[PDB]
A paper describes a structure:
In the native structure, a chloride ion occupies the oxyanion hole, which is formed by the β6-β7 loop (residues 133–142, further referred to as oxyanion-hole loop, OHL). The backbone N-H of Arg136 provides the first hydrogen-bond donor of the oxyanion hole. A water molecule as second hydrogen-bond donor supports anion stabilization, as does the positive local environment established by these two arginine residues. An extensive network of hydrogen bonds stabilizes the OHL. Moreover, the N-termini of helices α8 of PrV pUL26N point towards each other with the positive dipole moment compensated by one chloride ion per monomer. The quaternary structure is a homodimer related by a two-fold non-crystallographic axis with an interface area of 1,273 Å2 (native dimer) and 1,258 Å2 (inhibited dimer) comparable to all previously published structures (~1,300 Å2, determined by PDBePISA). The native and inhibited dimeric structures of pUL26N are nearly identical with an r.m.s. deviation of 0.39 Å (437 aligned Cα atoms, secondary-structure matching) over the whole dimer. A putative cation was found in both dimeric structures from PrV. Since the crystallization buffers contain MgCl2, it is highly probable that these cations are Mg2+ ions. Thus, Mg2+ ions or divalent cations with related properties are presumably necessary for the observed crystal packing of dimeric pUL26N from PrV.
Numbering used by the authors:
A (entry chain A): 1 to 218
B (entry chain B): 1 to 224
Write the structure that this text describes.
Amino acid sequence: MGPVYVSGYLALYDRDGGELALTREIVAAALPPAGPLPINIDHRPRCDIGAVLAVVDDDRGPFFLGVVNCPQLGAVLARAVGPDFFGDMRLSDEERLLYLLSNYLPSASLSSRRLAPGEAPDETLFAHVALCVIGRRVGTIVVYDASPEAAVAPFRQLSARARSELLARAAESPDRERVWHMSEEALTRALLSTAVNNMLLRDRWELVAARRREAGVR
Amino acid sequence: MGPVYVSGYLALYDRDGGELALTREIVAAALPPAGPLPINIDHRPRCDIGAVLAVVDDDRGPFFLGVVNCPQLGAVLARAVGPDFFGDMRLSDEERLLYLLSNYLPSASLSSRRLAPGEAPDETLFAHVALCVIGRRVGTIVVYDASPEAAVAPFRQLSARARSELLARAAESPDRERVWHMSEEALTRALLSTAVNNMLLRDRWELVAARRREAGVRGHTYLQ
Ligand SMILES: [Cl-]
Ligand SMILES: [Cl-]
Ligand SMILES: [Cl-]
Ligand SMILES: [Cl-]
Ligand SMILES: [Cl-]
Ligand SMILES: [Cl-]
Ligand SMILES: [Cl-]
Ligand SMILES: [Mg+2]
């Protein structure tokens, strides 16, 4: 059961504030990321399920494209759905996973390293990307799909130029063919943590729609 | 880690349409139940965590009291929450569990046997009560507490007769002291399942508040 692709803005210039805001200089200084930038769930360690294949400096913000390739992830989500969730649809295991992910983990969160005094930011700044329900930064929705082309397609304001650099760099990433095997039991726990930690969140589908409208997805 | 009690209306007469409505006649006919009704998580099979100790036909609808006593539930739920989840609060283990359950599974859903054509509703009609996020029926919020009389107290329109009858029958249930073991793994799976199956639900907390008003529990306010 082959890989999944995920993409989206990691931040949108001029939209946040305080601790959250990302600057053009800093973003410019921080690309290309120096090392593999893993992708995990809700910032948990020991919970890597993929990696950023490329990040690009689009006009509106830094934009990324990721691979998530963890066979158990599909097992665990498919096991959880009840028998009538899909009504009379017949879905491939790939399609089901795409839908469940999309709706279970619809946002991303970039974490960065703390800089020491006077220390100019460089390519070591970005640490990883977490999938999560709501990211704190404006417009941090993700799209998941079966190809990198389909994953980026719904981002209407992503420049053509950035999209081209993005896909090209991603096709050359060393991580692109990789697999993350993970214990079913540890995944089930991570994902239950997601639900329990967001169980009290109010108006979640309204905030997701808002994040989509921010990112420029229909 | 002890038992906890759960209670609420399984339906309110005249408050649902079509498929969902339970009439007085159906309830009258279906009580008391032929055998003990298990409590499970969101209708999943192989995940019983308790049992319905008694059901009564209150004026407004059928009302139940149940026990939940699955020892691993507290550990699984507590393992799930982030470490600053409770901020500064000092809570017993039992208080943490009741809070987490109350908010994770705030409703109940009475599941019925599907009848064959020509088959009249009887004492075997009721199959189980599932704990869940929002039940399809109006007014099916539940209350969890450390004792049965406390579990039932917030339902300010439950008749005193029904309330006394409820507690009496529960006091003589054979399930009163049972325990329901599950492996951690099987329980984590079942709880994740509720999350997945309910992830698409819109306005759940507004619908919770509405279910509270419907059932006659003093509605939770947030004015302070
Ligand atoms: Cl890159
Ligand atoms: Cl964030
Ligand atoms: Cl362009
Ligand atoms: Cl919502
Ligand atoms: Cl009974
Ligand atoms: Cl229901
Ligand atoms: Cl809500
Ligand atoms: Mg498609």
